[PDB]
Symmetry: C6
Subunit: 227 residues, 6 copies
């Protein structure tokens, strides 16, 4: 694949994050990315060539396959993985902006050495005191919360879309009724059992990730209330 | 693929750029390159072998396929990606030229230590004061503006070409009328729905990028007016 | 494949581990990962195309194949390898937490230089004395033991599942009785002998790993009793 | 592919070159190498299997294909790319020889510290004064000019060969007359339109490169006359 | 392939070894690994699809192929390569243990500065005097000898197994007698000549390696007697 | 491919070599390795599936193909490349042995500071004076000459074998006479013209390399006579 850039960026962002965020990144790296690339994507290798129908009408097989699978599961999961990673990058960008502000303020104070008072109050407001121990307060906390909410809503929306379109199982026999197939025809899928097992596994993984980020949100809210 | 060199050059150029430029580079890396390489290009894997027509005339299938698809979408998108990346490299080259001029002027001034006056006026004219904080003024701003305009016009031209040639959807049945096929024949495509979905997705991404660079141009014009 | 990330993490974790753990990691890297990727996975390359049955009823071949192989052995082994590696990562995370606590306590004591007494008692309780010679005592030992137990139970559960589903051999002829195949039909597998040999080899490797981790658990219990 | 070594050597040689040479190297890296590897080579993926003729005489298809395509375009372009890169490596070798001579002369002068006069005259003759600012004078200029001429003549020779053999377009229908095909037969190509488009694109790129190196030669001649 | 980890470990272990061991490692890297990966494994690319028999009885081809090839040569050679590399890793582990003991003893002596006498006698017994010039004496020599013997016996056992199973040549025509094939049938192999040539080449390489390690054992025994 | 290790070793050995040796290494890297991997090996991609004969006798096609091609050209060229690279590695090993001797002698002399006389005479005999400027004298020259002779004889032997077996062209039609084909049959090859062109190209490259190493041998003999 080509997941090198996204993996590198996630490795860059995982340095400064909460424990729940680190666990979420770890499970995303292990189960969502590694498992799909290694063995899951090989199952959908001949979902088109092994598909066949019980007719001799030309062109009915392509129409029935297009009717049966509007979009492959592997591509759907890739799109989901892409769409549940942007807000972390947004948080990384905001952290880098905070770092730039810290560097400029440090340069100004080094130049200086009531200005000390305002420099210190600005360094405390952004949570930059130890030169490498950026804390979450004011803006970073807001960005983190909105990122968590966006990730959760994207995941639940994708899950609902998948539930509406396909369901959570693949029957061994599919009934096709569309031109130019005369009347109704019978078509047979390929590897229904493995696909059902992997779909259930991915559903479980998605639910676990949802619960994990919910726990992370609750913990960060409690930490904010602590102050 | 072989996108390593272009990715490395873009990673080199992203160090000194405006926020809008950085966001544009990020979206180009994520959606334009990564998504196409990972899953999109696999859909157009058997657009030739799965294509079939309702006739037994030899050689009609090849002619009808050539009539239907003058150029594959994947190759068109690759060409578009290549053609909407050169001006950034031109800006990078101009920045490197400015760096070379800065190094030579620094060498001359170190040698010296009214010549100081002209050295300082030349260092201010090119915006080279802090030895690593090159600012946009005079020539760099002009190059940046012309690069943005060239990128925008290339993108809109490619979009217009795609609209004229194909459209934005693929019908499940295609009508073919060309020798040696007798009279008219019916041919059936492969995976119309996935291809339509991905075409719409790419169109949305291109429009978003166009809006982003328009916003970047407006912001840089306002910044120039600020002076 | 894409085993780079997991291999890197295991290379990170192997630095601080017992001898039995190092031997287990070595055998996992050599026989479980390298062997499967190099030659074993190529055997299951045409288990679908070479499968054929003695009938001309349309769609019976797909149904019989789905009946015969609920899940491929290669995917099962990949899932097993993934599921017998998490607790080591958990131990690595706990070790990193101990390192963070050590760094914070060192910072506090450097700041100080009865507080010395409590600093020393906390550094001894976590087994952090030589600044890079973390010892197993109290919590690390408990985490190590529970990780070993979890790994063992996961391995035995996977072995039992494989025994119940398939067995440990593949007969050259399979009997299929499922709709729409009329009455009973005969279907012939592909490369039964190589698959049986590799299944037996993997079973032997799994048993060896089980014995090795049992020995490691006994040795660590004896070491704990030594104190 | 395996273009890593040649790319590394070109990256090594681009450090010391004229602006025209750098632009030529950039366009060679972008359009000649990257574009061909990414998408162009995939078009010629089934030029043999999709080729078919209107006959049932055994062995006529292979003979007609061999008659139609003496050598594939992709292989021809690869050979051209290889044959229009050697003189740059020759220039790199000569530069390395100059560097070796500079190092030996520096060692001899460091040992010494009329010999100073001859050391200085030899350091000026080879254009080695600043220890890392090698200038083009005498021999390097001659090597550069002959390298440019060799590159230009190789490119024009390859272009003429391609014009004589194929032309610049591929007709959808080819007429074959060769044993054992009885009388004349009709054979149909695969993807004529994409191949014609890419051939025209490569021709334009080659012409642009020719013009660029002509401009570089004129500029370097003017620079030589400047002295 | 995935031979990166084993190659890295062998590169780590080759630093401290006898000349015969280094030559054996070099020949193993060149002829056993590189040659098999580059060109040898491509020959066994269609040993299943090109195999065909002279009958129309369904399912006889699979049975006859399974009868003819119990296990492919490429997989057998991969298993042999894996099984003739473990003892070197065991020697590497013992060397690392010696290094750990050396580091601990050095730490204790640095702390000290009759204890000097025992420290020196322990440093001489393990052959650790120059801090990086570990010599073979007592235990390392025993481990080296047993590793050489284990490697030799594994190689000869694999050679005997291959001789018993297949032989050293592949006849162009194979006779098959097994159900459901009626009476006897004739089946034809694929590329017999290349496979025979490569089998003979691998046999010669294995014999050369056996002779080389025998010479290494004799030389190390003579060196031990020298003391 | 897997040419990384051999390429790395050749990159290691090219540091200390004569100009002719460096040119030979460069041409070997460019034309022998890069060209074969990039485009040449793709031509022999379907030399088995596209091969067909004018008969309906079962099993005659495999026999005729085995008769026609005892060993593929690509594998022959890979074997040749492997067999014309060992003596350079032998020279590298001898150079490393000389380096080890130099390091030990330097250690002994540093310890010392008539022994100086013998140390200096041994350092001059092996041509080790400047600590990094090893010269060819006595043994290194002999090893270099024998390596050149071995390389030349291996290349000429491989060329003679290829001339005897195949020739230097491939006719479009092959006549096959071997059981079970009745009487004589006609079989047709695949892509004869491209294969002939590439064979002629490889022959020219081999002759050029032979001439280059002959020139290198003559030059080194003249240099030896110079002393
Ligand atoms: C049931 C768990 C409920 C809490 C779950 C909390 C989340 C969880 O499960 O792991 C993350 C957590 C915090 O780790 P983290 O390093 O971020 O935080 C440490 C500590 O918990 C405080 O946050 C700070 O120290 P102190 O206290 O001011 O001296 C300081 O962090 P910060 O403030 O500078 O950033 C650290 O010393 O790790 C723990 O071990 C918590 C202690 C209890 C671990 C044992 C379980 C009670
Ligand atoms: C609605 C936003 C409209 C503006 C969008 C502007 C574009 C946008 O959305 O992000 C980029 C922007 C500029 O970032 P950047 O680092 O380039 O610029 C900072 C700052 O904005 C000034 O440009 C300079 O400081 P000062 O001011 O002279 O002390 C100095 O940059 P420069 O001059 O040395 O290169 C920096 O401190 O980031 C912000 O946070 C803007 C502040 C407002 C952020 C909050 C929103 C108002
Ligand atoms: C039959 C083997 C039964 C034991 C199997 C034990 C497991 C096994 O087979 O290998 C691991 C083992 C321990 O190695 P490791 O480096 O962890 O431990 C060394 C030593 O054994 C003690 O643990 C400590 O030294 P001391 O003793 O306090 O001076 C110190 O470790 P630690 O305490 O600081 O972490 C080390 O010097 O290696 C051996 O050579 C054991 C000695 C006997 C090797 C010869 C066989 C008796
Ligand atoms: C129409 C252009 C015609 C010329 C095209 C020339 C080719 C072209 O388009 O780009 C390359 C060119 C030379 O760049 P390069 O760094 O090699 O050369 C710089 C300069 O031009 C002189 O060559 C030298 O300085 P000076 O002058 O002695 O103080 C010194 O180089 P050198 O001598 O130590 O190696 C450098 O300062 O870049 C320019 O900006 C030229 C100035 C005009 C740029 C603006 C356009 C006039
Ligand atoms: C027919 C060859 C029979 C012997 C084959 C022996 C094996 C073979 O063919 O290559 C390996 C061999 C030993 O190399 P290696 O570096 O291990 O050993 C060198 C030397 O031979 C002694 O072993 C030691 O020096 P000294 O002697 O105490 O001053 C010291 O090694 P060590 O003791 O510190 O580890 C080294 O100086 O290389 C040679 O050149 C041997 C000399 C003769 C080379 C010329 C042929 C006679
Ligand atoms: C027709 C060519 C016939 C000779 C072909 C010779 C082979 C060829 O074509 O390139 C290699 C050659 C030698 O290069 P290399 O760096 O090995 O050798 C240089 C020099 O030639 C002498 O060998 C030594 O210097 P000096 O002389 O003692 O001060 C010293 O090398 P060494 O001794 O310390 O190792 C070096 O300065 O390069 C040349 O430029 C030769 C000079 C003439 C180049 C111009 C052509 C005459």
């Amino acid at each position: 694949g080509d997941w090198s850039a996204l993996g590198k960026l996630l490795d860059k962002v995982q340095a400064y994050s909460t424990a729940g965020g680190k666990v979420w990144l770890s499970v995303l790296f292990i189960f969502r990315i590694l498992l799909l690339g290694t063995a899951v994507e090989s199952a959908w290798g001949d979902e088109q060539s092994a598909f066949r129908c019980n007719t001799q009408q030309p062109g009915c097989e392509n129409v029935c396959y297009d009717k049966s699978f509007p979009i492959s599961h592997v591509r759907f999961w890739v799109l989901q993985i892409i769409f549940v990673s942007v807000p972390t990058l947004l948080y990384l960008a905001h952290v880098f902006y905070v770092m730039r502000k810290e560097e400029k303020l440090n340069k100004k104070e080094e130049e200086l050495k009531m200005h000390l008072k305002q420099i210190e109050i600005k360094k405390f407001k952004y949570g930059i005191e130890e030169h490498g121990k950026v804390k979450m307060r004011g803006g970073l906390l807001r960005t983190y919360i909105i990122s968590i909410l966006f990730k959760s809503i994207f995941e639940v929306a994708f899950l609902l879309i998948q539930w509406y379109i396909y369901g959570f199982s693949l029957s061994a026999v599919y009934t096709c009724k569309r031109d130019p197939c005369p009347h109704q025809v019978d078509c047979f899928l390929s590897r229904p059992t493995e696909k059902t097992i992997f779909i259930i596994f991915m559903l479980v993984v998605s639910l676990v990730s949802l619960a994990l980020n919910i726990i992370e949100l609750f913990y960060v809210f409690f930490k904010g209330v602590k102050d």
